[PDB]
mmCIF file of C-alpha atoms and ligand atoms in Angstrom:
data_model
loop_
_atom_site.group_PDB
_atom_site.id
_atom_site.type_symbol
_atom_site.label_atom_id
_atom_site.label_comp_id
_atom_site.label_asym_id
_atom_site.label_seq_id
_atom_site.Cartn_x
_atom_site.Cartn_y
_atom_site.Cartn_z
ATOM 1 C CA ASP F 1 71.599 53.827 138.254
ATOM 2 C CA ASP F 2 74.234 52.933 136.118
ATOM 3 C CA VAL F 3 76.144 50.420 138.204
ATOM 4 C CA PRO F 4 79.089 48.388 137.084
ATOM 5 C CA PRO F 5 78.473 44.791 136.613
ATOM 6 C CA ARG F 6 80.791 42.448 139.422
ATOM 7 C CA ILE F 7 78.825 45.214 141.877
ATOM 8 C CA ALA F 8 75.567 44.437 140.319
ATOM 9 C CA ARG F 9 75.879 40.802 140.353
ATOM 10 C CA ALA F 10 77.138 41.725 144.019
ATOM 11 C CA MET F 11 73.762 43.138 145.191
ATOM 12 C CA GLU F 12 72.005 40.518 143.178
ATOM 13 C CA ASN F 13 70.922 38.715 146.661
ATOM 14 C CA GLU F 14 70.963 41.846 149.111
ATOM 15 C CA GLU F 15 66.930 40.527 150.715
ATOM 16 C CA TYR F 16 68.879 37.250 152.084
ATOM 17 C CA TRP F 17 70.219 36.438 155.132
ATOM 18 C CA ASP F 18 73.442 34.635 153.038
ATOM 19 C CA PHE F 19 75.005 37.368 151.500
ATOM 20 C CA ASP F 20 78.793 37.938 150.703
ATOM 21 C CA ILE F 21 79.771 40.814 151.895
ATOM 22 C CA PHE F 22 83.147 40.615 151.301
ATOM 23 C CA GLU F 23 83.150 40.433 147.416
ATOM 24 C CA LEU F 24 80.934 43.187 147.305
ATOM 25 C CA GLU F 25 83.737 44.830 149.536
ATOM 26 C CA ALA F 26 85.911 42.997 146.643
ATOM 27 C CA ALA F 27 84.679 44.494 143.986
ATOM 28 C CA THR F 28 83.137 47.722 145.050
ATOM 29 C CA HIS F 29 87.254 48.587 147.007
ATOM 30 C CA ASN F 30 86.249 48.941 149.476
ATOM 31 C CA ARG F 31 83.352 51.240 149.324
ATOM 32 C CA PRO F 32 80.760 48.414 150.156
ATOM 33 C CA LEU F 33 78.691 51.224 151.638
ATOM 34 C CA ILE F 34 77.883 53.589 149.313
ATOM 35 C CA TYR F 35 76.706 50.988 146.327
ATOM 36 C CA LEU F 36 74.025 48.480 149.448
ATOM 37 C CA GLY F 37 73.586 52.288 150.784
ATOM 38 C CA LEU F 38 72.271 53.731 147.361
ATOM 39 C CA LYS F 39 70.483 50.306 146.308
ATOM 40 C CA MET F 40 68.906 50.016 149.970
ATOM 41 C CA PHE F 41 67.829 53.163 149.986
ATOM 42 C CA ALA F 42 66.272 53.565 147.739
ATOM 43 C CA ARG F 43 64.436 49.886 147.663
ATOM 44 C CA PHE F 44 62.999 51.509 151.345
ATOM 45 C CA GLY F 45 62.432 54.990 149.700
ATOM 46 C CA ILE F 46 64.241 57.073 152.372
ATOM 47 C CA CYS F 47 65.383 59.653 149.834
ATOM 48 C CA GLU F 48 61.123 60.165 148.901
ATOM 49 C CA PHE F 49 60.361 60.734 152.771
ATOM 50 C CA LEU F 50 63.648 62.762 152.977
ATOM 51 C CA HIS F 51 62.833 64.745 149.537
ATOM 52 C CA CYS F 52 66.607 64.612 149.159
ATOM 53 C CA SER F 53 67.594 63.914 145.424
ATOM 54 C CA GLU F 54 70.217 61.462 144.715
ATOM 55 C CA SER F 55 72.815 63.279 143.846
ATOM 56 C CA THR F 56 72.584 64.527 147.747
ATOM 57 C CA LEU F 57 72.105 60.775 148.764
ATOM 58 C CA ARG F 58 75.519 59.951 146.922
ATOM 59 C CA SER F 59 77.837 63.094 148.746
ATOM 60 C CA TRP F 60 76.066 61.796 151.531
ATOM 61 C CA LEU F 61 77.500 58.178 151.488
ATOM 62 C CA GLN F 62 80.307 59.409 149.990
ATOM 63 C CA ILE F 63 81.675 61.489 152.823
ATOM 64 C CA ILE F 64 80.788 59.035 155.928
ATOM 65 C CA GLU F 65 82.276 56.295 154.358
ATOM 66 C CA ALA F 66 85.342 58.559 153.332
ATOM 67 C CA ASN F 67 85.806 59.228 157.113
ATOM 68 C CA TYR F 68 85.261 55.179 157.480
ATOM 69 C CA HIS F 69 88.687 54.226 158.151
ATOM 70 C CA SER F 70 90.489 51.379 155.627
ATOM 71 C CA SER F 71 93.183 50.561 158.429
ATOM 72 C CA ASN F 72 90.908 49.034 160.438
ATOM 73 C CA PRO F 73 90.471 45.663 160.473
ATOM 74 C CA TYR F 74 87.410 44.960 161.453
ATOM 75 C CA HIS F 75 85.475 48.225 161.927
ATOM 76 C CA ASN F 76 86.227 49.969 158.502
ATOM 77 C CA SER F 77 82.881 50.248 156.268
ATOM 78 C CA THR F 78 82.515 47.198 154.942
ATOM 79 C CA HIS F 79 81.523 46.978 158.670
ATOM 80 C CA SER F 80 78.935 49.312 158.539
ATOM 81 C CA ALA F 81 77.178 48.077 155.051
ATOM 82 C CA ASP F 82 77.337 44.240 157.110
ATOM 83 C CA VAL F 83 75.622 45.941 159.815
ATOM 84 C CA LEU F 84 73.089 48.265 156.751
ATOM 85 C CA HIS F 85 72.759 44.609 155.892
ATOM 86 C CA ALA F 86 71.223 43.282 158.761
ATOM 87 C CA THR F 87 69.328 46.270 159.882
ATOM 88 C CA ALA F 88 67.174 45.804 156.494
ATOM 89 C CA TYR F 89 66.989 42.763 156.979
ATOM 90 C CA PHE F 90 65.462 42.944 160.640
ATOM 91 C CA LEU F 91 63.104 46.005 158.931
ATOM 92 C CA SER F 92 62.789 42.979 156.145
ATOM 93 C CA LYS F 93 60.470 41.207 159.236
ATOM 94 C CA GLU F 94 56.359 40.650 159.387
ATOM 95 C CA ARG F 95 56.941 41.862 163.278
ATOM 96 C CA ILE F 96 59.528 44.937 163.245
ATOM 97 C CA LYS F 97 56.717 45.800 159.547
ATOM 98 C CA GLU F 98 53.400 45.895 161.733
ATOM 99 C CA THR F 99 55.879 47.815 164.806
ATOM 100 C CA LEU F 100 57.521 49.948 163.592
ATOM 101 C CA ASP F 101 56.847 53.633 161.565
ATOM 102 C CA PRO F 102 58.265 54.593 158.181
ATOM 103 C CA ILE F 103 59.916 57.611 160.372
ATOM 104 C CA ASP F 104 62.104 54.558 162.482
ATOM 105 C CA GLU F 105 62.808 52.138 159.159
ATOM 106 C CA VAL F 106 64.360 55.864 158.061
ATOM 107 C CA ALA F 107 66.565 56.109 161.761
ATOM 108 C CA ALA F 108 67.478 52.641 161.458
ATOM 109 C CA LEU F 109 69.483 52.420 158.768
ATOM 110 C CA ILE F 110 70.955 55.879 158.814
ATOM 111 C CA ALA F 111 71.813 55.072 162.523
ATOM 112 C CA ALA F 112 73.520 51.677 160.748
ATOM 113 C CA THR F 113 74.783 53.716 158.542
ATOM 114 C CA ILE F 114 77.024 56.609 160.959
ATOM 115 C CA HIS F 115 76.883 54.310 164.002
ATOM 116 C CA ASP F 116 80.771 53.682 163.490
ATOM 117 C CA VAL F 117 82.139 56.368 161.707
ATOM 118 C CA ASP F 118 85.622 57.349 162.509
ATOM 119 C CA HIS F 119 86.385 54.618 164.555
ATOM 120 C CA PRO F 120 90.422 54.830 165.588
ATOM 121 C CA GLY F 121 90.035 50.880 165.443
ATOM 122 C CA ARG F 122 90.269 51.599 169.307
ATOM 123 C CA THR F 123 88.018 50.880 172.405
ATOM 124 C CA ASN F 124 86.724 53.859 174.893
ATOM 125 C CA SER F 125 88.261 52.810 177.551
ATOM 126 C CA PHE F 126 92.107 52.795 175.588
ATOM 127 C CA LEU F 127 90.923 55.854 174.715
ATOM 128 C CA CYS F 128 89.673 57.252 178.091
ATOM 129 C CA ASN F 129 93.343 55.349 180.199
ATOM 130 C CA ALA F 130 95.252 56.403 177.001
ATOM 131 C CA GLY F 131 93.633 60.057 177.290
ATOM 132 C CA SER F 132 92.883 60.748 174.129
ATOM 133 C CA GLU F 133 90.761 63.852 172.904
ATOM 134 C CA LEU F 134 87.853 62.749 172.363
ATOM 135 C CA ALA F 135 88.286 61.182 175.144
ATOM 136 C CA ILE F 136 89.086 64.673 177.120
ATOM 137 C CA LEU F 137 85.852 66.011 174.573
ATOM 138 C CA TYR F 138 83.214 63.921 175.497
ATOM 139 C CA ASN F 139 84.472 63.336 179.276
ATOM 140 C CA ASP F 140 84.902 59.413 179.578
ATOM 141 C CA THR F 141 81.199 58.912 179.096
ATOM 142 C CA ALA F 142 80.104 57.869 175.900
ATOM 143 C CA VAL F 143 82.907 58.355 174.514
ATOM 144 C CA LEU F 144 83.100 57.033 171.163
ATOM 145 C CA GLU F 145 79.612 56.235 170.112
ATOM 146 C CA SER F 146 78.994 60.792 171.131
ATOM 147 C CA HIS F 147 81.805 60.674 168.243
ATOM 148 C CA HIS F 148 80.135 58.747 165.409
ATOM 149 C CA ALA F 149 76.471 59.997 166.380
ATOM 150 C CA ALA F 150 78.316 63.753 166.277
ATOM 151 C CA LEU F 151 80.777 63.821 163.238
ATOM 152 C CA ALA F 152 77.685 62.200 161.317
ATOM 153 C CA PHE F 153 75.655 66.068 161.961
ATOM 154 C CA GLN F 154 78.718 67.858 161.808
ATOM 155 C CA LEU F 155 79.588 66.179 157.852
ATOM 156 C CA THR F 156 76.070 65.948 157.118
ATOM 157 C CA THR F 157 74.320 69.310 157.709
ATOM 158 C CA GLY F 158 78.441 71.150 157.456
ATOM 159 C CA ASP F 159 77.988 70.814 153.454
ATOM 160 C CA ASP F 160 74.638 71.911 151.605
ATOM 161 C CA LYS F 161 75.164 69.114 148.522
ATOM 162 C CA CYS F 162 75.871 65.959 151.936
ATOM 163 C CA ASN F 163 72.319 67.775 154.325
ATOM 164 C CA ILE F 164 69.656 64.575 152.846
ATOM 165 C CA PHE F 165 68.021 66.111 155.578
ATOM 166 C CA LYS F 166 67.740 70.361 154.176
ATOM 167 C CA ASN F 167 64.090 69.326 152.810
ATOM 168 C CA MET F 168 62.713 68.165 156.032
ATOM 169 C CA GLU F 169 60.169 69.424 158.472
ATOM 170 C CA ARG F 170 61.617 71.690 161.656
ATOM 171 C CA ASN F 171 59.887 69.013 163.308
ATOM 172 C CA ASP F 172 60.367 65.460 161.844
ATOM 173 C CA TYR F 173 64.045 65.947 161.529
ATOM 174 C CA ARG F 174 63.990 67.220 165.637
ATOM 175 C CA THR F 175 61.653 64.354 165.355
ATOM 176 C CA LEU F 176 64.213 61.933 163.145
ATOM 177 C CA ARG F 177 67.215 62.998 164.698
ATOM 178 C CA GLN F 178 66.493 62.261 168.283
ATOM 179 C CA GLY F 179 66.364 58.667 166.551
ATOM 180 C CA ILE F 180 69.089 58.247 164.719
ATOM 181 C CA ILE F 181 71.318 59.182 168.557
ATOM 182 C CA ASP F 182 69.438 56.989 170.587
ATOM 183 C CA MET F 183 70.709 54.036 168.022
ATOM 184 C CA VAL F 184 74.085 54.995 168.245
ATOM 185 C CA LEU F 185 74.803 55.852 171.485
ATOM 186 C CA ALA F 186 72.385 52.048 172.211
ATOM 187 C CA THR F 187 75.818 50.414 170.665
ATOM 188 C CA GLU F 188 78.262 51.433 173.719
ATOM 189 C CA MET F 189 78.422 47.978 175.232
ATOM 190 C CA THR F 190 78.933 49.307 179.134
ATOM 191 C CA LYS F 191 74.534 49.024 178.534
ATOM 192 C CA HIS F 192 74.216 46.060 176.645
ATOM 193 C CA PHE F 193 72.010 43.558 179.685
ATOM 194 C CA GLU F 194 70.730 47.474 180.312
ATOM 195 C CA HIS F 195 68.401 47.124 176.913
ATOM 196 C CA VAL F 196 68.012 44.139 176.653
ATOM 197 C CA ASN F 197 67.140 43.430 180.022
ATOM 198 C CA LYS F 198 64.166 46.132 179.603
ATOM 199 C CA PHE F 199 63.674 44.218 175.996
ATOM 200 C CA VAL F 200 62.282 41.359 177.341
ATOM 201 C CA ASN F 201 60.923 42.877 180.877
ATOM 202 C CA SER F 202 58.984 45.841 178.422
ATOM 203 C CA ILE F 203 57.959 43.424 175.485
ATOM 204 C CA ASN F 204 58.135 39.289 175.583
ATOM 205 C CA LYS F 205 57.462 39.121 178.991
ATOM 206 C CA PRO F 206 54.345 41.426 178.393
ATOM 207 C CA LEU F 207 53.419 39.714 175.069
ATOM 208 C CA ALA F 208 54.243 35.871 176.447
ATOM 209 C CA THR F 209 51.122 36.983 179.071
ATOM 210 C CA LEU F 210 48.636 38.638 176.204
ATOM 211 C CA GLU F 211 49.673 35.239 173.754
ATOM 212 C CA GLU F 212 47.668 33.181 176.834
ATOM 213 C CA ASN F 213 44.256 35.357 176.144
ATOM 214 C CA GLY F 214 43.784 32.902 172.521
ATOM 215 C CA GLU F 215 43.982 34.103 168.855
ATOM 216 C CA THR F 216 41.208 37.282 168.954
ATOM 217 C CA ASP F 217 41.335 40.242 167.271
ATOM 218 C CA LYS F 218 40.132 42.967 170.128
ATOM 219 C CA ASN F 219 43.037 40.744 171.903
ATOM 220 C CA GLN F 220 45.614 41.258 167.836
ATOM 221 C CA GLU F 221 44.479 45.462 169.087
ATOM 222 C CA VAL F 222 45.676 45.210 172.833
ATOM 223 C CA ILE F 223 49.289 43.574 171.815
ATOM 224 C CA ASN F 224 48.913 46.065 168.692
ATOM 225 C CA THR F 225 48.236 49.264 171.786
ATOM 226 C CA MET F 226 50.571 48.516 173.984
ATOM 227 C CA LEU F 227 54.201 47.556 171.256
ATOM 228 C CA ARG F 228 53.418 50.645 169.163
ATOM 229 C CA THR F 229 54.205 52.845 172.057
ATOM 230 C CA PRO F 230 57.194 55.821 172.110
ATOM 231 C CA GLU F 231 59.120 53.942 174.418
ATOM 232 C CA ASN F 232 58.445 49.870 173.171
ATOM 233 C CA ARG F 233 59.029 51.031 169.773
ATOM 234 C CA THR F 234 61.972 52.944 171.299
ATOM 235 C CA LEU F 235 62.943 50.000 173.362
ATOM 236 C CA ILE F 236 62.723 47.420 169.890
ATOM 237 C CA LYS F 237 64.717 50.291 168.033
ATOM 238 C CA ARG F 238 67.674 49.771 170.706
ATOM 239 C CA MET F 239 67.263 45.807 170.265
ATOM 240 C CA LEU F 240 67.345 46.278 166.575
ATOM 241 C CA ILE F 241 70.383 48.323 165.867
ATOM 242 C CA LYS F 242 72.231 46.017 168.895
ATOM 243 C CA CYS F 243 71.432 42.941 166.891
ATOM 244 C CA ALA F 244 72.274 44.059 163.853
ATOM 245 C CA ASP F 245 75.720 45.914 165.235
ATOM 246 C CA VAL F 246 77.071 42.179 166.294
ATOM 247 C CA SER F 247 75.039 39.900 164.254
ATOM 248 C CA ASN F 248 78.560 38.117 162.715
ATOM 249 C CA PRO F 249 78.021 35.158 164.375
ATOM 250 C CA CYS F 250 74.570 34.279 163.262
ATOM 251 C CA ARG F 251 76.282 34.476 159.651
ATOM 252 C CA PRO F 252 76.959 31.923 157.186
ATOM 253 C CA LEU F 253 80.386 30.041 158.789
ATOM 254 C CA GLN F 254 82.529 31.433 156.016
ATOM 255 C CA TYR F 255 81.667 35.236 157.319
ATOM 256 C CA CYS F 256 81.570 34.089 160.692
ATOM 257 C CA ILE F 257 85.523 33.243 160.752
ATOM 258 C CA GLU F 258 86.346 36.238 158.599
ATOM 259 C CA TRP F 259 84.758 38.960 161.581
ATOM 260 C CA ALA F 260 86.388 36.909 164.595
ATOM 261 C CA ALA F 261 89.743 37.463 162.208
ATOM 262 C CA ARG F 262 89.317 41.169 161.358
ATOM 263 C CA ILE F 263 88.084 42.057 165.516
ATOM 264 C CA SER F 264 90.735 39.445 167.019
ATOM 265 C CA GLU F 265 93.274 41.526 165.229
ATOM 266 C CA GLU F 266 92.484 44.840 166.353
ATOM 267 C CA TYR F 267 92.203 43.664 169.633
ATOM 268 C CA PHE F 268 95.960 42.136 169.269
ATOM 269 C CA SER F 269 96.974 45.602 167.538
ATOM 270 C CA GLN F 270 95.646 47.699 171.061
ATOM 271 C CA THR F 271 97.162 44.871 172.998
ATOM 272 C CA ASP F 272 100.589 46.254 171.122
ATOM 273 C CA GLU F 273 100.315 49.620 171.392
ATOM 274 C CA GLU F 274 99.482 49.067 175.101
ATOM 275 C CA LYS F 275 102.173 46.555 176.741
ATOM 276 C CA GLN F 276 104.941 49.932 174.754
ATOM 277 C CA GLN F 277 102.993 51.553 175.551
ATOM 278 C CA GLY F 278 102.680 51.598 179.278
ATOM 279 C CA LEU F 279 99.053 51.426 179.153
ATOM 280 C CA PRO F 280 97.100 49.287 181.614
ATOM 281 C CA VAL F 281 95.644 46.179 179.856
ATOM 282 C CA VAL F 282 91.624 46.069 179.143
ATOM 283 C CA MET F 283 92.053 42.998 176.908
ATOM 284 C CA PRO F 284 94.649 40.339 178.060
ATOM 285 C CA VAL F 285 93.390 37.707 177.454
ATOM 286 C CA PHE F 286 93.093 39.781 173.709
ATOM 287 C CA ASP F 287 96.633 39.294 173.387
ATOM 288 C CA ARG F 288 98.453 37.375 169.296
ATOM 289 C CA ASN F 289 101.015 36.263 171.888
ATOM 290 C CA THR F 290 98.368 34.139 174.412
ATOM 291 C CA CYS F 291 94.572 34.373 172.592
ATOM 292 C CA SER F 292 92.783 31.131 171.544
ATOM 293 C CA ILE F 293 90.707 32.750 168.500
ATOM 294 C CA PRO F 294 88.540 30.261 168.618
ATOM 295 C CA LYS F 295 87.832 30.110 172.819
ATOM 296 C CA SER F 296 86.964 34.062 172.930
ATOM 297 C CA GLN F 297 84.914 33.460 170.474
ATOM 298 C CA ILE F 298 82.870 31.151 172.367
ATOM 299 C CA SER F 299 82.732 32.960 175.638
ATOM 300 C CA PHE F 300 81.651 36.419 173.658
ATOM 301 C CA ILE F 301 78.611 34.119 172.090
ATOM 302 C CA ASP F 302 77.836 32.691 176.193
ATOM 303 C CA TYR F 303 77.976 36.540 177.563
ATOM 304 C CA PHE F 304 76.919 38.772 175.454
ATOM 305 C CA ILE F 305 75.202 37.279 171.719
ATOM 306 C CA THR F 306 73.296 33.799 173.151
ATOM 307 C CA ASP F 307 70.345 35.751 175.750
ATOM 308 C CA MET F 308 70.328 38.845 172.981
ATOM 309 C CA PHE F 309 69.665 36.903 170.485
ATOM 310 C CA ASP F 310 67.446 34.849 172.135
ATOM 311 C CA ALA F 311 65.443 37.161 173.241
ATOM 312 C CA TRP F 312 65.243 38.603 169.740
ATOM 313 C CA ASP F 313 63.999 36.108 167.544
ATOM 314 C CA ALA F 314 61.370 35.726 170.449
ATOM 315 C CA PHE F 315 60.083 38.789 169.237
ATOM 316 C CA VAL F 316 60.773 38.628 165.382
ATOM 317 C CA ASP F 317 60.995 34.706 165.026
ATOM 318 C CA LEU F 318 64.777 34.491 163.251
ATOM 319 C CA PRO F 319 64.903 30.498 162.495
ATOM 320 C CA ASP F 320 68.213 30.940 159.732
ATOM 321 C CA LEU F 321 70.272 32.980 162.233
ATOM 322 C CA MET F 322 70.398 31.227 164.662
ATOM 323 C CA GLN F 323 69.926 28.217 162.828
ATOM 324 C CA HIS F 324 74.138 29.693 161.952
ATOM 325 C CA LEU F 325 74.567 30.800 165.287
ATOM 326 C CA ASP F 326 73.777 27.218 166.060
ATOM 327 C CA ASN F 327 76.514 26.133 163.560
ATOM 328 C CA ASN F 328 79.257 28.455 164.252
ATOM 329 C CA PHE F 329 78.695 27.625 168.129
ATOM 330 C CA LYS F 330 79.038 24.114 167.713
ATOM 331 C CA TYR F 331 82.376 25.191 164.301
ATOM 332 C CA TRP F 332 84.147 27.129 167.781
ATOM 333 C CA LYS F 333 84.552 23.370 169.368
ATOM 334 C CA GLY F 334 85.669 20.748 167.271
ATOM 335 C CA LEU F 335 89.019 23.483 166.724
ATOM 336 C CA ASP F 336 90.025 21.619 170.202
ATOM 337 C CA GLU F 337 91.518 18.832 168.651
ATOM 338 C CA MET F 338 93.153 17.451 171.881
HETATM 339 N N1 LIG I 401 83.118 38.256 167.500
HETATM 340 C C1 LIG I 401 83.035 39.421 168.206
HETATM 341 N N2 LIG I 401 84.126 39.029 169.335
HETATM 342 C C2 LIG I 401 83.878 40.259 169.611
HETATM 343 CL CL1 LIG I 401 85.691 39.713 170.636
HETATM 344 N N3 LIG I 401 84.029 41.068 169.694
HETATM 345 C C3 LIG I 401 83.256 41.933 168.825
HETATM 346 C C4 LIG I 401 82.861 40.250 167.540
HETATM 347 N N4 LIG I 401 81.782 41.306 167.005
HETATM 348 C C5 LIG I 401 81.833 42.897 166.965
HETATM 349 N N5 LIG I 401 82.390 42.775 167.764
HETATM 350 C C6 LIG I 401 82.886 43.531 168.872
HETATM 351 C C7 LIG I 401 82.216 43.258 170.385
HETATM 352 C C8 LIG I 401 80.853 43.896 171.432
HETATM 353 C C9 LIG I 401 80.370 44.100 172.213
HETATM 354 O O1 LIG I 401 78.919 44.026 172.699
HETATM 355 C C10 LIG I 401 78.195 43.990 171.953
HETATM 356 C C11 LIG I 401 77.580 45.995 172.137
HETATM 357 F F1 LIG I 401 77.691 45.385 173.934
HETATM 358 F F2 LIG I 401 78.611 46.569 172.111
HETATM 359 C C12 LIG I 401 81.493 43.529 174.223
HETATM 360 C C13 LIG I 401 82.494 43.426 173.320
HETATM 361 C C14 LIG I 401 83.640 42.549 174.268
HETATM 362 C C15 LIG I 401 82.755 43.412 175.529
HETATM 363 C C16 LIG I 401 83.799 42.322 176.234
HETATM 364 N N6 LIG I 401 85.342 41.305 176.300
HETATM 365 C C17 LIG I 401 84.793 41.034 175.285
HETATM 366 C C18 LIG I 401 84.546 42.061 174.006
HETATM 367 C C19 LIG I 401 83.036 43.296 171.828
HETATM 368 MG MG1 LIG I 402 80.040 51.253 168.074
HETATM 369 ZN ZN1 LIG I 403 79.559 48.700 164.845
#
């Protein structure tokens, strides 16, 4: 409530897509998530739904943000706040507003907040090759995604002052827990094409089929009944967390570039550590001594971003994201020059 002035000004236009996430990061002193979380959760009315106090939410936001590693270039608490900001923005669109229910909005906002908690600036494949404690613990299977979700529930329910779920119904919490886990596990890179194709086949193609019938009141109710089933909501939630997680190439160019630098530097570090130790190089192209960052972003956009956001856009209508996506793609091309 009683927030300082620069951070208050930094969080002024958080409903808008164009938002200065790095000014918030600078102003909050590597604590963007607690400030942005408090505003978002209050605006969506999350503690009113969960029956937590504002103090239990402050304690919760602090302990999870504390477990984000500041030393990570990209996977730090600013990424989580960025991913939280995009999640809120997608939940605020009419399509999602008239498809998802209140309990899904809470699962989405929480999942965004925790999805990368205690990330070690390293990929799953590094941990598996290295034989890390988590790779042995999770059996080389969604090693970090499992850990992010697990630790988040360990820190939440392990302390009474941090437990934002303590005043819930047994059945509401069990449903919410399942929804958070699913969305956090859905961010694993290996399941990308499985989750994009399920979204196209179960949502976009059936919805495009029903679009031929014309705008009718009976036809809208059939569209409403089909989309609002538990399965298709799970497919929409997975798509929403996936798009928010990698929404950086759809940002204003200044932010797009900054995100590319952070993620690249984090992969350059891993590749240096793989060479020094003699581990098998999983990302050979991402070495500081060989990598073109503009070319690597173009390739990244082609393989993952283009088809995924095209499908999400066709469902939600995100012209500003796709307009930024075109401008940023064209900027990366413009840096060749020879
Ligand atoms: N601008 C970005 N560039 C690159 Cl190179 N990786 C990024 C970026 N923003 C998030 N990531 C992380 C990420 C996510 C991802 O997929 C989203 C979901 F499927 F997990 C795939 C890769 C990735 C996979 C293989 N080679 C390179 C990068 C990296
Ligand atoms: Mg992750
Ligand atoms: Zn992430």
